[PDB]
Amino acid sequence: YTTEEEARRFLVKFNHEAENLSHESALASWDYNTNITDENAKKMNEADNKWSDFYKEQSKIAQGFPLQEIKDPIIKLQLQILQQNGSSVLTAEKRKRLSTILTTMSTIYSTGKVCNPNNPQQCFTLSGLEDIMEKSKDYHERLWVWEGWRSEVGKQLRPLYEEYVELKNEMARGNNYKDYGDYWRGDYETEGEKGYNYSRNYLMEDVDRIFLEIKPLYEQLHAYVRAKLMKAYPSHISPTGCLPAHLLGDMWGRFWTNLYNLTVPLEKEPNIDVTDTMKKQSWDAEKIFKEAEKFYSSVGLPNMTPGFWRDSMLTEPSDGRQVVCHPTAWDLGKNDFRIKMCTKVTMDDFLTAHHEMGHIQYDMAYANQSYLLRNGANEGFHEAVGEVMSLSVATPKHLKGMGLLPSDFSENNETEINFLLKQALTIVGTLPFTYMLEKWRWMVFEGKIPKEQWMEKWWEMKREIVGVVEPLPHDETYCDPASLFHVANDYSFIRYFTRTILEFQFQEALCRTAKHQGPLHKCDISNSTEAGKKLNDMLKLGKSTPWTYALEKIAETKEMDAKPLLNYFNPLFRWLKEQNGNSVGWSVDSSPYSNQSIKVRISLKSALGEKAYEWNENEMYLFQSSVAYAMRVYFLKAKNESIPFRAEDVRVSDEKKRVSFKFFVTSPTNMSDIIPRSEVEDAIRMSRSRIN
Amino acid sequence: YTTEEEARRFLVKFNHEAENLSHESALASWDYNTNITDENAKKMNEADNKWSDFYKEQSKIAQGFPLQEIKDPIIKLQLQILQQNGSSVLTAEKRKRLSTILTTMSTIYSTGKVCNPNNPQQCFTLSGLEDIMEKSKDYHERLWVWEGWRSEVGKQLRPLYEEYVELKNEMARGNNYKDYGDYWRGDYETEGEKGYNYSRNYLMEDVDRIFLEIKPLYEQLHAYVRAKLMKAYPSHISPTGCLPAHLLGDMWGRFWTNLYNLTVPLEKEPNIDVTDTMKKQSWDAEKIFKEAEKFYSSVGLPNMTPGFWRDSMLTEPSDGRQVVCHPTAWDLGKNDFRIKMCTKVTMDDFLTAHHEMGHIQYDMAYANQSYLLRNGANEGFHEAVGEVMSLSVATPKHLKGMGLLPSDFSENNETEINFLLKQALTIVGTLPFTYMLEKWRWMVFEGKIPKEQWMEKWWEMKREIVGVVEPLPHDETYCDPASLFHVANDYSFIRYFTRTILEFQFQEALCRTAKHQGPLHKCDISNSTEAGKKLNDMLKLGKSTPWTYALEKIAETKEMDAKPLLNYFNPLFRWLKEQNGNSVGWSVDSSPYSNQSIKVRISLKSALGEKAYEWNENEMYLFQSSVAYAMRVYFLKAKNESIPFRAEDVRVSDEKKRVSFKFFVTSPTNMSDIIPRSEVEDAIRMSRSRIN
Amino acid sequence: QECDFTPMLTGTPPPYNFKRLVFTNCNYNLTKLLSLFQVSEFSCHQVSPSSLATGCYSSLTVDYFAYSTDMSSYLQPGSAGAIVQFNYKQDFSNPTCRVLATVPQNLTTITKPSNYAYLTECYKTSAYGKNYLYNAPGAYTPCLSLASRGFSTKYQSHSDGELTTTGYIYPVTGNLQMAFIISVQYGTDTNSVCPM
Amino acid sequence: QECDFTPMLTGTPPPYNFKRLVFTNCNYNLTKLLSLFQSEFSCHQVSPSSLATGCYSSLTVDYFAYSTDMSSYLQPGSAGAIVQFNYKQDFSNPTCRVLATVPQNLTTITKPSNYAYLTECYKTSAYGKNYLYNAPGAYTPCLSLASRGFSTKYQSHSDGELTTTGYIYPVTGNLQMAFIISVQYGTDTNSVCPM
Ligand SMILES: *[C@@H]1O[C@H](CO)[C@@H](O[C@@H]2O[C@H](CO)[C@@H](O)[C@H](O)[C@H]2NC(C)=O)[C@H](O)[C@H]1NC(C)=O
Ligand SMILES: *[C@@H]1O[C@H](CO)[C@@H](O[C@@H]2O[C@H](CO)[C@@H](O)[C@H](O)[C@H]2NC(C)=O)[C@H](O)[C@H]1NC(C)=O
Ligand SMILES: *[C@@H]1O[C@H](CO)[C@@H](O[C@@H]2O[C@H](CO)[C@@H](O)[C@H](O)[C@H]2NC(C)=O)[C@H](O)[C@H]1NC(C)=O
Ligand SMILES: *[C@@H]1O[C@H](CO)[C@@H](O[C@@H]2O[C@H](CO)[C@@H](O)[C@H](O)[C@H]2NC(C)=O)[C@H](O)[C@H]1NC(C)=O
Ligand SMILES: *[C@@H]1O[C@H](CO)[C@@H](O)[C@H](O)[C@H]1NC(C)=O
Ligand SMILES: *[C@@H]1O[C@H](CO)[C@@H](O)[C@H](O)[C@H]1NC(C)=O
Ligand SMILES: *[C@@H]1O[C@H](CO)[C@@H](O)[C@H](O)[C@H]1NC(C)=O
Ligand SMILES: *[C@@H]1O[C@H](CO)[C@@H](O)[C@H](O)[C@H]1NC(C)=O
Ligand SMILES: *[C@@H]1O[C@H](CO)[C@@H](O)[C@H](O)[C@H]1NC(C)=O
Ligand SMILES: *[C@@H]1O[C@H](CO)[C@@H](O)[C@H](O)[C@H]1NC(C)=O
Ligand SMILES: *[C@@H]1O[C@H](CO)[C@@H](O)[C@H](O)[C@H]1NC(C)=O
Ligand SMILES: *[C@@H]1O[C@H](CO)[C@@H](O)[C@H](O)[C@H]1NC(C)=O
16 A cells, blocks of 8 residues: 555655755855855855755665665656765765865865976966966977976875775775766766667767767868968977977867967958947946847747846945856746846857856746756756857847847858857867867776876877877876866766767757758847747756657757768868868877987897896986986086086886887976987997996 | 365355255155155155265265365364265176176075975965074974075075175275275274274284183083083983084074073072053053153253154054054154154063163264264164163162062072073173174185185084084085075174173273172162263264274273173173083084994095096086985885985085095985984995996 | 725735725716826727726726836736736736826825735645646636735745745835726626716 | 233234333232133242232233143253243243133134244354354344244254254144243332232
8 A cells, every 4th residue: 555655755745845945055155155254154054064964864764765666767766866875885984084185186286386497486376377378479488387387286196196096996886886987977878768778888889989970070170280380380390290288279278269369361351349339339237138138038938037137146246245257047946046247348248148048048947847856957958058049149140130230241251261260179179188088087997907007098098089299208107187177176077078069969950940041050040939949848858858858859869960060060171171182190109309319229138147137116217327427527528518417307218118218318407309319329429338 | 275174165065055855855764664655655766866966966076175185183084984986986887787686685585485395385484484493392393494494595695696795806906995804894993092003903803802701601601501402302412512503593593592491490480570560550652751751861861852742653653554663763853853663561662662762862962063973983882872771771679669660579699690691691692603704704705715615614613613513514505604684785794793892891881980889780870960971971972083082981991891791790600600610612523413424435546546537526426326226225125115215315525535525315305314324334335336 | 876996095005915896876087087196107908098988887997006117017918927827817808908106195094015025936736846826817816825924034935735835025115106907897787887 | 100011912922032011100900910811820939929019120021822731841950942942941030930821702812823933043163053052131142034934844044154943833722821920129110019
């Protein structure tokens, strides 16, 4: 007589009291975020402590209920989400150790600093450092700063990260999952039945196929970028080699947009600039919001409730309480919607406001489902919904048709090319990097490669896929990949790729209904209702259904594809086909320090036999010291100069145990290419068996 | 019809007009010091620029007048003071170089920084570093911080200081002076009143005799301090050796007062503490000044101008115009006087107020003399006048007799001993240091010591006179003496010794008139007039006369002596004679790193001659690396640890080029080695001809 | 007798609350109607107010509701806001007239209410979801019941049995404003309100 | 005639400046003297009551703008500038010093803009500057260019080879002033007689 209605009643029970408490917690958080005061910290603490206490008590009382007896998928999803133990199966000491090490890593990342030998009393933090990286135009200084930051941050992050990954893998193994990689992979499909055969492991080959398909366009773009880059820095780029890592204009290389200034086809044609009209009209902060509301209502979706316009944060507080301008779409529930942002008069502000309003209007549509299901189907839809509208609104034709941008502008067959190139330098540039980083993190996690091969694997990979070569050889003690942000905060880093694909997937699918004629980049979401009906049908589902069902609802396909993406870039592909029609590709061998080093052949230990020994480190020590002494005496021999060469002036590289070395020497304080081959060759020839 | 009355007319045209600009300029400086604003800054600029304009035009128009034709000493003094070329005889390029290097030295000193390998993200400046040195009581930490600051500051001050000394010597030579030392000595010099003979050279032997006489008391005090120090840090102080430099409590050792806590004979007897009376009565800032005025007038000196009491800076302004609380006694002239200080209720504030009152009294007592003579006779009187009164007012008997400190206190024969010890730990501690530093600077400037021996002499001296031994060997590249304050600001440093003698020189002679009975420390300047008359006779003379005559007026002697000083300490001397009556002295050989080092002297070169060459500061590198490798393999072979021994881990010591020297090894990251002799001896014996 | 609504000027207007009043054979003057209040704004469903000055027919429908000026923009039915399905129904019937008013101070009998209050979410809770009820013509917010308790805080909410209610409180500043609805019923009968 | 000083209530009192007032055989009542003003009186060991009888040589009435707090320094016990560089504190036949804070009843009295007392008037020379001092019966012999006036703090001006520098004290609230009564012994024609 129990069946599963006991679950039904228990569900109703937490439904009664979850919403209100969530409301007070969220309003306390907003109150802090608006006004910064000490008492607000105590308020949030006394709210969140009891909020988490309610989480823990309800979880511990909900654990005993069985799962295999559940038949209805709707309640089964909620029960499976709820009936989770996770880290609770871990003993306290290691849990607190994990928390402490995570906090230590965050703190050590937050307080970096790199200082030059020339003026050791002046130097920067990450902010001014990034500013210099963005503005500077000197090869030497940029290489220097990148190397300095990487060395300083890496040297203090090896053992901590090693222990972190060890403990995480142990936790994942103890949580019934094969590896932490599985645990992250235990999401983002986690379903499929009666029409859907797919499981967790299939994602690997899905992304592999997608990247393989997308490769050629990126290869062509890379060819063009390499061809153009040699203008700025001659005698540094091999015609068939890769590119220096530090020359990608950004700290890491996640975005290439900053290179646009250098790859502009020509400066003869000015771009679109209509800031004058709004600046002279001086639109109020509310005018843009009202216009955006009119635009969105033009497609049929319901407009926001009047109560929203009262409780809001449209303008600058103009009060002593300092606030941050990072746009946010606070969804408090119970039809309490608020937007936090400071408003100015710029196109970027316009598109950001449109994005935030898209966020909030998507959130509104599904308010009546439940509490636990108040979420997106995956990690990509929520941002995709805003991104599609943001892409649509920027089209010049609509801007001309809505009142701004008068008809005194005749577009040509090159301006759209410039717009497409600008979009491509960001939409596609980050895909190889994201793929490479995610793959490397996975394989490190499950333990396929031992710890000692981390850095030797990393640079090989960067040579293979992305097409970037290290500026200077790096030994094993470094921990380059930890210098990033998302690496040091244990944030899942797969959403970006799938989000970028689904964006254009939805764009093409929806534009299909509009019955456009020309290239997809000219599509519009102007007056229409069937498109709005389809969009509402998509959004209202929420988390109650598998996402593949949603794609079938619009995309009518059970999987993703790059065909819409390449179709959207077809004019760009044809334009680029006429510029690099002779050569394209790379070789994973060449490098800047390739024509400068010396072979330094190695004699076999067994050939010597007597008085022979394996390195066990500590011996290239002697080689470096001896060659440094030889160089010091060499300069005194005829050059009559007093350069105090040091021990760490010899660069080990490309070692195979007892099989080979390679090295070259650099000046104490101007390490770019100095001390060419001939000088060191003469110096080493001069000396005698005092070395070997 | 010329004679020298033309000089009289010139001096009239000078004195009648040289005023009425200083007043306004100093008023602007006062306004800036009280009000911090940019308008005040530009006021100071526009005032001082024309002030220096007037100075330089007066100088350039006054140069042509002859000197040998002047017979009256009074006018001759003013003419000699006004007529001088100085740096004007230098080229513009050298002058700007000197200014730039001085500014660079000041800037680099003001922005020091040191911090530990353990927590590199946090580092300190001098302000908190001095506090850490003052409070910290850890041998390891204090030695570490001292070494770090010394290294960091010294490494960036060698070439600049070399250039500075070279240029200063050149310019001094170009100004008709043998050496810069002579130029500095030109301020103590004075002519004779037909029975006085005082040349610059005589000063050296005078100070030498004074120091030789004073030595025994300092020797006994040093014996007691050494005997006491071993309580805190056992197994660090040789019974007959010197003391570590970093253990002198203060950053450099310029004062010893901070050791009082450790050298207190016993804590059973509480000291004088009468803060309660004025803390509960809350003496206002005005009443302390009024009482000090009453005290000063009691001896017969004229009281301050009534107009003063309004225009002053007695209290805190209590506004946003931030001010600094350094006590100053500004003499604006034209009977305009001001005292600048923030007043609290403490004994130290009381004595500082009395000191400033003495300063202003002495300054005001003379106003009839011409402008150019409105200064002290030498560099010592102007502070000696205040210091003598400050010493006099601190006596407990007077404080009892003036209303405070009721008669409910019976002094014993030990409390006065504690007071005398407290005074001695500051009055006498700094004399050896000052003498040593001045001698070193003199000899370096004149040029007997070549540059290459700059640092080898300093530590010898510190072993000889003061009685301090370095904690770790220091090579030639260091620049220890420039890490101080006055050295980096080119301020003459000899005044302190003469002033320190002169306070007691005056005290004894003046108390002679009062007809005291007991020890001089019980003397008083209570109600009386003849002493005031003598003081007026001393002060009113001004700069119009040689200072030896001033001493003869009250001191009635042509030279200074330490006999009053030792007499003042006679009870202290007899008390200490009963504590170290067996052993006292030191040997300039012992050192902390003496029983833990091994000679290395093999005459490899001179023994054979072939395949070896003279030491060229380079093969030292080979030896360093070789011994580091030997230690590495010695640890790895059996101890099984990973200590990446560096190159900078072997300490080179005294050198003669005679193939003999010592050293010891140190841990990579502790700066305090243990590494007994046996281990390093075994490691070096294990190795083979790979090294030598 | 006369079709007069004199006792209307008594005090606080209905906040979700509603009323219905009807008259009999009578005579009503246009002069008093004009003198009721000055011209702020009136919108009639394609019926001239002047033509209404003649003709005795079934009945009128007079009601005054607390409101505000700006929200009259959203008064016009062009969206599914909470005002129509989750608050007082915007009932559509025989052509009617809507009037906005800002009452002057000299009518001292009227009492200014403490604060405005319009419902946001009243619904019959269920297992899977919320199961929103939607207002219908001739229903007047069927939720009612526990809504009589009152509202005291922002987003104040309370539930009884299995009905849950929550509303919004709008503080009042300055002079208040009123909204008048005059819905008409045609046909001459005993209930008919006659002119003069 | 009546030894009356009615025109004293005329306007601004003398600032270094001085004047001489004397009378002849007359009658004077103590009632008007008492009604003149209410604050502190100090006589040179002479009872004011005993002065109400007897006709003899003359009185010495003079009124000088001044401040209450500086009256402490008024008493000669120091070499402050008030005596040797400002109005002489002449000592003679026992006199009387009185302090006053004049009310506003009689508007004829005019409040001066600011007070002014000399600080340094001297005879400039070659080595020093001849800090000459005031003497009894001299009334600040410097004078001369001091009549020009003072405008700024520590304002200074010199003429020929005489240099002068004074102080300007802003006045807040009701003005304050002092009397001096130095009487001359002996009965004669100019003697002031009581009644
Ligand atoms: C490090 O050495 C490089 C190589 O010589 C220097 O770069 C040169 O800088 C000059 C400046 O006039 C340029 O004209 C040359 O073309 C540069 N050479 C190369 C190969 O790029 C660089 O300046 C040195 N850096 C420092 C700090 O001394
Ligand atoms: C400045 O003036 C003072 C007095 O204010 C002079 O002091 C006099 O000096 C003479 C010298 O012969 C003595 O005879 C007097 O007795 C001193 N007078 C007092 C009151 O002490 C002082 O000499 C003057 N200075 C100069 C340089 O002329
Ligand atoms: C450097 O080595 C010294 C060796 O003495 C360490 O000093 C000792 O540290 C231990 C604890 O490790 C204490 O118990 C001893 O009292 C210390 N002093 C001795 C034995 O004389 C010192 O801690 C080391 N430095 C660091 C940073 O670990
Ligand atoms: C949440 O609200 C949506 C609003 O669209 C409801 O959608 C309704 O779905 C039913 C069938 O389940 C249709 O008959 C209605 O026409 C839909 N209403 C629309 C499109 O406005 C949805 O059912 C609600 N969910 C729950 C659990 O009540
Ligand atoms: C989760 O952890 C809890 C608490 O230890 C335990 O009772 C339960 O069996 C675990 N397994 C699942 C599937 O929840
Ligand atoms: C999917 O199909 C494969 C291949 O037949 C099969 O091995 C697997 O069990 C299927 N999985 C599901 C969930 O149907
Ligand atoms: C790019 O060039 C523009 C002008 O075309 C300039 O304002 C801007 O600073 C440059 N840098 C970046 C990063 O855009
Ligand atoms: C919809 O049609 C109206 C008709 O007036 C037109 O003004 C408006 O621009 C159209 N909107 C869009 C988005 O095309
Ligand atoms: C100073 O310089 C001037 C100007 O060149 C010169 O006449 C004079 O001899 C120099 N010497 C002295 C001592 O002033
Ligand atoms: C000091 O005495 C020496 C030695 O007799 C003599 O040469 C010198 O001239 C004297 N100096 C003075 C200033 O009297
Ligand atoms: C000395 O000891 C006293 C207590 O006797 C303490 O307050 C003080 O901090 C110590 N240090 C110094 C430098 O006086
Ligand atoms: C000097 O003696 C007088 C008269 O007894 C007394 O008032 C005064 O305080 C004494 N002064 C000192 C400094 O003791």
